[PDB]
Amino acid sequence: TNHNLHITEKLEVLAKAYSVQGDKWRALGYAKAINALKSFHKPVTSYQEACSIPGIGKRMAEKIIEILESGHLRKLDHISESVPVLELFSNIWGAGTKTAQMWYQQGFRSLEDIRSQASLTTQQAIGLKHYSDFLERMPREEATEIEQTVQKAAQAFNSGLLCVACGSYRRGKATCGDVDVLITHPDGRSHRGIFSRLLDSLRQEGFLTDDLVSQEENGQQQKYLGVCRLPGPGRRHRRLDIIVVPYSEFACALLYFTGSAHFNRSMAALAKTKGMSLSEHALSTAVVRNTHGCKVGPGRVLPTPTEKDVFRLLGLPYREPAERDW
DNA sequence: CGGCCGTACTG
DNA sequence: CAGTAC
DNA sequence: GCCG
Ligand code: NA
Ligand code: NA
Ligand code: NA
């Protein structure tokens, strides 16, 4: 399916380098180019052809042809020797490019250096100790078990609750880097107060081991980001997200948390070109603005009972989860 | 050239 | 607010 | 990085 593998592998290396260095826009640009290459119907055979692909410009075309005709990309030999370390540091949940840069300027070079000498935020300390477990993508089965665990715990409070694992799991991938469980209820009200009760229950059985983000001093359209671990010998710690939402937002939440991230932003961009706005909450008319183009409030929500409804209103052919990698 | 999805917590 | 993440 |  990817006729340009020999090419996308090389471009991915540069993209990642720019990314870990904080050059976010340059990296986003590469991503869209790389994605466009992956979906191209055949191997790219010329500069002109490459440039013709939406998402690929002169700069990228030039590199593509260089790889195509020589089998290599010289720019790769000129990547700063600091990239591997910056990557290692930003692999720690809670630590981004700014923190990786700080640690590198202070002279740190290994996870051991970070452990013994770096100032760590509460979230980062958790990210560090579970570094390896978090970098390992778990097999689909485990994801299923984690999702079932959350479902049973929630349904024990209200059998009507609907629980759905999204992210890569819903996109049908064989391995998952995390598990995101979306919860709601058909009656449009019984989702209230589930968060608190659900968390304490999961903590009761030792399933939840660490909390990264969880504002339990607020009961509104919530989110929990933490660490879970299935009972039983040898089980690793895994990243678990729990989002509880009202029934009216279910479709957009399902669409957003299923992803991918590239797909979400592409859809949102597309929504704006049609005078609309897409968020994990809803599909609305264009947001309201002030004299100087400043946003002074939300647009009007357009009811979307199902994901199909979002595509319909955007004038786009429906896409199944497995087809949303970008 | 300037904009690049829209939004949720931490400290 | 600046950073990080979904 | 790309695009308009
Ligand atoms: Na192009
Ligand atoms: Na990180
Ligand atoms: Na909605």
CSV table of C-alpha atoms (C1' of nucleotides) and ligand atoms in Angstrom, one decimal:
chain,number,residue,atom,x,y,z
A,1,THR,CA,0.0,0.0,0.0
A,2,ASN,CA,2.9,2.4,0.5
A,3,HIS,CA,4.8,2.5,-2.8
A,4,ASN,CA,7.1,5.1,-1.5
A,5,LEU,CA,8.4,3.3,1.6
A,6,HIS,CA,12.1,3.7,0.7
A,7,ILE,CA,11.3,7.4,0.7
A,8,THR,CA,9.0,8.0,3.7
A,9,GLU,CA,11.4,6.1,6.0
A,10,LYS,CA,14.1,8.8,5.3
A,11,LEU,CA,11.8,11.8,5.6
A,12,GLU,CA,10.4,10.5,8.9
A,13,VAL,CA,13.9,10.7,10.4
A,14,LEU,CA,14.2,14.4,9.5
A,15,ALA,CA,10.6,15.1,10.7
A,16,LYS,CA,11.3,13.5,14.1
A,17,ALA,CA,14.6,15.5,14.4
A,18,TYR,CA,12.8,18.8,13.8
A,19,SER,CA,10.1,17.8,16.2
A,20,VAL,CA,12.2,16.9,19.2
A,21,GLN,CA,14.0,20.3,18.6
A,22,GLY,CA,10.8,22.3,19.0
A,23,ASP,CA,10.5,23.3,15.3
A,24,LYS,CA,6.8,22.3,15.5
A,25,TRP,CA,5.7,23.9,12.2
A,26,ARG,CA,8.5,22.5,10.1
A,27,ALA,CA,7.7,19.1,11.6
A,28,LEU,CA,3.9,19.4,10.9
A,29,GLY,CA,4.8,20.3,7.3
A,30,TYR,CA,6.9,17.2,6.9
A,31,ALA,CA,4.1,15.0,8.4
A,32,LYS,CA,1.5,16.2,5.9
A,33,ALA,CA,4.0,15.6,3.1
A,34,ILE,CA,4.9,12.2,4.4
A,35,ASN,CA,1.2,11.2,4.7
A,36,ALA,CA,0.5,12.4,1.2
A,37,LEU,CA,3.4,10.2,0.0
A,38,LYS,CA,2.1,7.1,1.8
A,39,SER,CA,-1.4,7.4,0.2
A,40,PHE,CA,-0.1,8.1,-3.4
A,41,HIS,CA,-1.3,5.5,-5.9
A,42,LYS,CA,2.1,4.6,-7.2
A,43,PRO,CA,5.8,5.2,-6.6
A,44,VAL,CA,6.8,8.9,-7.3
A,45,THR,CA,8.8,9.0,-10.5
A,46,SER,CA,9.6,12.7,-11.0
A,47,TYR,CA,10.0,16.1,-9.5
A,48,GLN,CA,7.0,17.5,-11.3
A,49,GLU,CA,4.8,14.6,-10.2
A,50,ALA,CA,6.0,15.0,-6.6
A,51,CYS,CA,5.2,18.8,-6.6
A,52,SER,CA,1.8,18.1,-8.1
A,53,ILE,CA,0.8,16.3,-4.9
A,54,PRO,CA,-1.1,18.5,-2.5
A,55,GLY,CA,1.0,18.8,0.7
A,56,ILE,CA,4.3,18.5,-1.1
A,57,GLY,CA,6.2,21.6,-2.2
A,58,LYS,CA,9.5,22.4,-3.9
A,59,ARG,CA,11.6,21.8,-0.8
A,60,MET,CA,10.1,18.4,-0.2
A,61,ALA,CA,10.0,17.4,-3.8
A,62,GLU,CA,13.7,18.1,-4.1
A,63,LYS,CA,14.5,15.8,-1.2
A,64,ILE,CA,12.1,13.1,-2.5
A,65,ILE,CA,13.9,13.0,-5.9
A,66,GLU,CA,17.3,13.0,-4.2
A,67,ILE,CA,16.3,9.9,-2.2
A,68,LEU,CA,14.6,8.3,-5.3
A,69,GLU,CA,17.7,8.7,-7.5
A,70,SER,CA,20.6,8.2,-5.0
A,71,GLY,CA,19.0,6.1,-2.3
A,72,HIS,CA,20.0,8.5,0.4
A,73,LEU,CA,19.4,12.0,1.9
A,74,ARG,CA,22.6,13.9,2.7
A,75,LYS,CA,20.8,16.2,5.2
A,76,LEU,CA,20.6,13.2,7.4
A,77,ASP,CA,24.3,13.2,8.0
A,78,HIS,CA,24.1,16.8,9.3
A,79,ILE,CA,21.6,16.2,12.1
A,80,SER,CA,22.7,17.7,15.4
A,81,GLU,CA,24.3,15.0,17.7
A,82,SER,CA,21.9,16.3,20.3
A,83,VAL,CA,18.8,14.9,18.6
A,84,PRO,CA,18.9,11.4,20.1
A,85,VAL,CA,19.2,12.8,23.6
A,86,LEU,CA,16.5,15.4,23.1
A,87,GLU,CA,14.3,12.5,21.8
A,88,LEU,CA,15.1,10.4,24.8
A,89,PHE,CA,14.2,13.2,27.1
A,90,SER,CA,10.9,14.1,25.4
A,91,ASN,CA,9.9,10.4,25.5
A,92,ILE,CA,9.2,11.1,29.2
A,93,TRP,CA,5.5,11.8,29.6
A,94,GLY,CA,5.1,15.4,30.8
A,95,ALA,CA,8.4,16.6,29.3
A,96,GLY,CA,8.3,18.4,26.0
A,97,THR,CA,10.9,20.1,23.8
A,98,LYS,CA,11.4,23.1,26.1
A,99,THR,CA,12.2,20.8,29.1
A,100,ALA,CA,14.4,18.5,27.0
A,101,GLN,CA,16.3,21.6,25.8
A,102,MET,CA,16.7,22.8,29.4
A,103,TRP,CA,18.0,19.4,30.6
A,104,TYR,CA,20.4,19.2,27.7
A,105,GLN,CA,21.9,22.7,28.4
A,106,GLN,CA,22.4,21.7,32.0
A,107,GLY,CA,24.6,18.9,30.7
A,108,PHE,CA,22.3,15.9,31.1
A,109,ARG,CA,22.7,13.1,28.6
A,110,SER,CA,21.1,9.9,30.1
A,111,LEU,CA,17.9,8.9,31.9
A,112,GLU,CA,20.2,8.2,34.8
A,113,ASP,CA,21.3,11.8,34.7
A,114,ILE,CA,17.7,12.9,34.7
A,115,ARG,CA,16.9,10.6,37.6
A,116,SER,CA,19.7,11.7,39.9
A,117,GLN,CA,20.2,15.4,39.0
A,118,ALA,CA,17.2,16.9,37.2
A,119,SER,CA,14.3,18.8,38.7
A,120,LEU,CA,11.1,16.9,37.8
A,121,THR,CA,7.5,17.9,37.9
A,122,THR,CA,5.2,15.5,39.7
A,123,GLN,CA,3.9,14.3,36.3
A,124,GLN,CA,7.5,13.8,35.0
A,125,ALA,CA,8.6,11.8,37.9
A,126,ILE,CA,5.7,9.4,37.0
A,127,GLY,CA,6.7,9.6,33.4
A,128,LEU,CA,10.3,8.7,34.2
A,129,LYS,CA,9.8,5.7,36.4
A,130,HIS,CA,7.4,4.1,33.8
A,131,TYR,CA,9.6,5.2,30.8
A,132,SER,CA,10.0,1.7,29.4
A,133,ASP,CA,6.5,0.5,30.0
A,134,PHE,CA,5.1,3.6,28.4
A,135,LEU,CA,7.3,3.3,25.2
A,136,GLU,CA,6.2,-0.3,24.7
A,137,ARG,CA,3.1,-0.6,22.6
A,138,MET,CA,0.8,-3.1,24.2
A,139,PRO,CA,-0.9,-5.9,22.2
A,140,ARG,CA,-4.6,-5.5,21.3
A,141,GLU,CA,-5.7,-8.2,23.8
A,142,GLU,CA,-4.3,-6.2,26.8
A,143,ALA,CA,-6.0,-3.1,25.6
A,144,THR,CA,-9.3,-5.0,25.4
A,145,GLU,CA,-8.8,-6.2,29.0
A,146,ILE,CA,-8.1,-2.7,30.2
A,147,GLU,CA,-11.2,-1.4,28.4
A,148,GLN,CA,-13.3,-4.3,29.8
A,149,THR,CA,-12.0,-3.5,33.3
A,150,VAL,CA,-13.2,0.1,33.1
A,151,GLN,CA,-16.5,-0.9,31.5
A,152,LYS,CA,-17.5,-3.4,34.2
A,153,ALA,CA,-16.5,-1.0,37.0
A,154,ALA,CA,-18.7,1.7,35.4
A,155,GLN,CA,-21.6,-0.5,34.5
A,156,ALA,CA,-21.8,-1.7,38.1
A,157,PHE,CA,-23.0,1.8,39.0
A,158,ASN,CA,-25.4,2.1,36.0
A,159,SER,CA,-25.8,-0.7,33.5
A,160,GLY,CA,-26.9,1.8,30.9
A,161,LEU,CA,-23.5,3.4,30.6
A,162,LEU,CA,-21.9,3.0,27.2
A,163,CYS,CA,-18.2,2.5,27.1
A,164,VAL,CA,-16.0,2.7,24.0
A,165,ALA,CA,-12.2,2.5,23.7
A,166,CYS,CA,-11.0,4.9,21.0
A,167,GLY,CA,-7.6,6.0,19.7
A,168,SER,CA,-5.5,3.5,17.8
A,169,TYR,CA,-7.5,0.6,19.4
A,170,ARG,CA,-10.7,1.8,17.7
A,171,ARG,CA,-8.7,2.4,14.5
A,172,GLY,CA,-8.1,-1.4,14.6
A,173,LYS,CA,-4.4,-1.4,15.2
A,174,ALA,CA,-2.7,-4.6,16.5
A,175,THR,CA,-0.7,-2.8,19.2
A,176,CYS,CA,-1.6,0.3,21.2
A,177,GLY,CA,0.6,2.9,23.0
A,178,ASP,CA,-2.3,3.8,25.3
A,179,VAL,CA,-6.0,3.2,26.0
A,180,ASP,CA,-8.6,5.9,25.8
A,181,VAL,CA,-12.1,4.9,27.2
A,182,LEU,CA,-15.0,7.2,26.3
A,183,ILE,CA,-18.1,6.9,28.5
A,184,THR,CA,-21.6,8.3,28.1
A,185,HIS,CA,-25.2,7.4,28.7
A,186,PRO,CA,-28.3,7.4,26.3
A,187,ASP,CA,-30.6,9.2,28.7
A,188,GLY,CA,-28.4,12.3,28.4
A,189,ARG,CA,-28.1,12.7,32.1
A,190,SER,CA,-26.9,9.5,33.8
A,191,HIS,CA,-23.3,10.2,32.9
A,192,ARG,CA,-23.2,12.8,35.8
A,193,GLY,CA,-21.3,11.8,38.9
A,194,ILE,CA,-19.8,8.7,37.2
A,195,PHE,CA,-16.2,10.1,37.2
A,196,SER,CA,-15.8,10.4,40.9
A,197,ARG,CA,-17.4,7.0,41.7
A,198,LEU,CA,-15.6,5.3,38.9
A,199,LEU,CA,-12.1,6.5,39.9
A,200,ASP,CA,-12.5,5.5,43.5
A,201,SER,CA,-13.7,2.1,42.4
A,202,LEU,CA,-10.7,1.5,40.1
A,203,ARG,CA,-8.4,2.8,42.8
A,204,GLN,CA,-10.0,0.3,45.3
A,205,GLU,CA,-8.9,-2.7,43.3
A,206,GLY,CA,-5.4,-1.4,42.7
A,207,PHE,CA,-6.0,-0.9,38.9
A,208,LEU,CA,-5.1,2.8,38.9
A,209,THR,CA,-1.5,3.3,40.2
A,210,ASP,CA,-0.7,6.9,39.4
A,211,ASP,CA,-2.6,10.0,38.4
A,212,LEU,CA,-1.2,12.5,35.8
A,213,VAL,CA,-4.3,14.7,35.3
A,214,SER,CA,-7.6,14.6,37.1
A,215,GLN,CA,-9.5,17.7,38.4
A,216,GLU,CA,-11.9,15.9,40.8
A,217,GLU,CA,-12.9,19.3,42.3
A,218,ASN,CA,-15.1,19.8,39.2
A,219,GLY,CA,-17.8,17.5,37.9
A,220,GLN,CA,-18.2,18.9,34.4
A,221,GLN,CA,-17.7,17.1,30.9
A,222,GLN,CA,-14.5,15.6,32.4
A,223,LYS,CA,-11.2,13.8,31.7
A,224,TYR,CA,-8.8,11.6,33.6
A,225,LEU,CA,-5.3,10.9,32.4
A,226,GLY,CA,-3.4,8.3,34.5
A,227,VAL,CA,-1.7,5.0,34.9
A,228,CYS,CA,-3.3,1.5,35.2
A,229,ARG,CA,-2.1,-2.0,35.6
A,230,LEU,CA,-3.9,-5.3,35.1
A,231,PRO,CA,-3.8,-7.7,38.0
A,232,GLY,CA,-1.7,-10.8,37.6
A,233,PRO,CA,2.0,-11.7,37.4
A,234,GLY,CA,4.3,-9.7,35.1
A,235,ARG,CA,1.9,-7.0,34.1
A,236,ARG,CA,3.4,-3.7,33.0
A,237,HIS,CA,2.0,-0.2,33.8
A,238,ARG,CA,0.0,1.4,30.9
A,239,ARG,CA,-1.3,4.8,30.0
A,240,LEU,CA,-5.1,5.0,30.5
A,241,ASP,CA,-7.4,7.9,29.6
A,242,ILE,CA,-11.0,8.1,30.7
A,243,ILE,CA,-13.3,10.8,29.2
A,244,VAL,CA,-17.0,11.0,30.3
A,245,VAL,CA,-19.3,13.1,28.1
A,246,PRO,CA,-22.9,14.0,27.7
A,247,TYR,CA,-24.9,12.0,25.1
A,248,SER,CA,-25.3,15.0,22.7
A,249,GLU,CA,-21.5,15.3,22.3
A,250,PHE,CA,-20.9,11.6,21.9
A,251,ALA,CA,-20.4,11.6,18.2
A,252,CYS,CA,-17.8,14.5,18.1
A,253,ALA,CA,-16.0,13.1,21.2
A,254,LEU,CA,-15.9,9.7,19.5
A,255,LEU,CA,-14.6,11.3,16.3
A,256,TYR,CA,-11.9,13.3,18.1
A,257,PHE,CA,-10.6,10.7,20.5
A,258,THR,CA,-10.5,8.0,17.8
A,259,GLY,CA,-8.2,10.3,15.9
A,260,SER,CA,-5.7,10.2,14.5
A,261,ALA,CA,-4.3,13.6,15.6
A,262,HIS,CA,-3.4,14.3,11.9
A,263,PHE,CA,-7.0,13.4,11.0
A,264,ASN,CA,-8.6,15.6,13.6
A,265,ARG,CA,-6.7,18.8,12.5
A,266,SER,CA,-7.3,18.0,8.8
A,267,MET,CA,-11.1,17.7,9.6
A,268,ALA,CA,-11.0,20.9,11.6
A,269,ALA,CA,-9.2,22.8,8.9
A,270,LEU,CA,-11.7,21.5,6.4
A,271,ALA,CA,-14.6,22.6,8.6
A,272,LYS,CA,-13.3,26.2,8.6
A,273,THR,CA,-13.1,26.4,4.8
A,274,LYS,CA,-16.9,25.8,5.0
A,275,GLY,CA,-17.7,28.4,7.6
A,276,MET,CA,-17.9,25.9,10.5
A,277,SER,CA,-15.9,24.9,13.5
A,278,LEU,CA,-15.1,21.4,14.8
A,279,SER,CA,-14.1,20.4,18.3
A,280,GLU,CA,-14.3,17.4,20.5
A,281,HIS,CA,-17.6,18.8,21.8
A,282,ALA,CA,-19.5,19.6,18.5
A,283,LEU,CA,-19.7,20.9,15.0
A,284,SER,CA,-20.7,24.5,15.0
A,285,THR,CA,-21.2,27.4,12.7
A,286,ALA,CA,-18.2,29.7,12.5
A,287,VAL,CA,-17.2,31.2,15.8
A,288,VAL,CA,-18.3,34.8,16.6
A,289,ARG,CA,-15.7,37.6,16.3
A,290,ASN,CA,-15.0,41.2,17.3
A,291,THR,CA,-13.9,44.3,15.5
A,292,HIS,CA,-10.3,43.1,15.0
A,293,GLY,CA,-10.9,39.5,14.2
A,294,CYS,CA,-10.9,38.4,17.8
A,295,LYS,CA,-13.1,35.5,18.9
A,296,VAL,CA,-15.8,36.7,21.2
A,297,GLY,CA,-17.8,33.5,21.7
A,298,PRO,CA,-18.8,30.1,20.2
A,299,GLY,CA,-20.8,29.5,17.0
A,300,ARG,CA,-24.1,27.8,17.0
A,301,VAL,CA,-24.0,24.0,17.6
A,302,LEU,CA,-25.3,21.8,14.7
A,303,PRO,CA,-26.8,18.6,16.2
A,304,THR,CA,-24.8,15.5,15.2
A,305,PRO,CA,-26.2,12.2,16.7
A,306,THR,CA,-23.6,10.1,14.9
A,307,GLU,CA,-20.1,10.4,13.3
A,308,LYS,CA,-21.8,10.0,9.9
A,309,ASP,CA,-23.7,13.2,10.7
A,310,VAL,CA,-20.5,15.1,11.1
A,311,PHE,CA,-19.2,14.0,7.7
A,312,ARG,CA,-22.5,14.6,6.1
A,313,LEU,CA,-22.7,18.3,7.2
A,314,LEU,CA,-19.1,18.8,6.2
A,315,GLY,CA,-19.9,17.4,2.8
A,316,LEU,CA,-17.3,14.6,3.1
A,317,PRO,CA,-17.6,10.9,2.2
A,318,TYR,CA,-17.8,9.0,5.5
A,319,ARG,CA,-14.6,7.3,6.7
A,320,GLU,CA,-14.4,4.2,8.9
A,321,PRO,CA,-12.1,4.3,11.9
A,322,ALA,CA,-9.4,2.1,10.3
A,323,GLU,CA,-9.2,4.7,7.5
A,324,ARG,CA,-8.5,7.7,9.7
A,325,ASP,CA,-4.7,7.4,10.3
A,326,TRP,CA,-4.7,10.8,8.5
B,1,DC,C1',4.4,36.7,3.6
B,2,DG,C1',1.9,35.0,7.9
B,3,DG,C1',-1.1,31.0,9.7
B,4,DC,C1',-0.7,26.4,10.8
B,5,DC,C1',-7.4,22.1,15.0
B,6,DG,C1',-9.8,23.1,19.0
B,7,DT,C1',-9.5,22.5,23.6
B,8,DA,C1',-8.4,20.6,28.8
B,9,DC,C1',-5.3,20.9,33.4
B,10,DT,C1',-1.1,21.8,36.0
B,11,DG,C1',2.0,24.9,39.2
C,1,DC,C1',1.3,32.8,31.8
C,2,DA,C1',4.3,29.0,29.7
C,3,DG,C1',4.5,24.3,29.1
C,4,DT,C1',2.5,20.0,28.0
C,5,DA,C1',-0.8,16.9,26.4
C,6,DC,C1',-5.3,15.0,24.4
D,1,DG,C1',7.9,22.4,6.2
D,2,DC,C1',3.1,23.8,3.0
D,3,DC,C1',-0.5,26.7,1.4
D,4,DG,C1',-3.2,30.7,-0.1
E,1,NA,NA,2.0,20.5,-3.8
E,2,NA,NA,7.1,14.0,26.6
E,3,NA,NA,-22.2,17.8,19.7
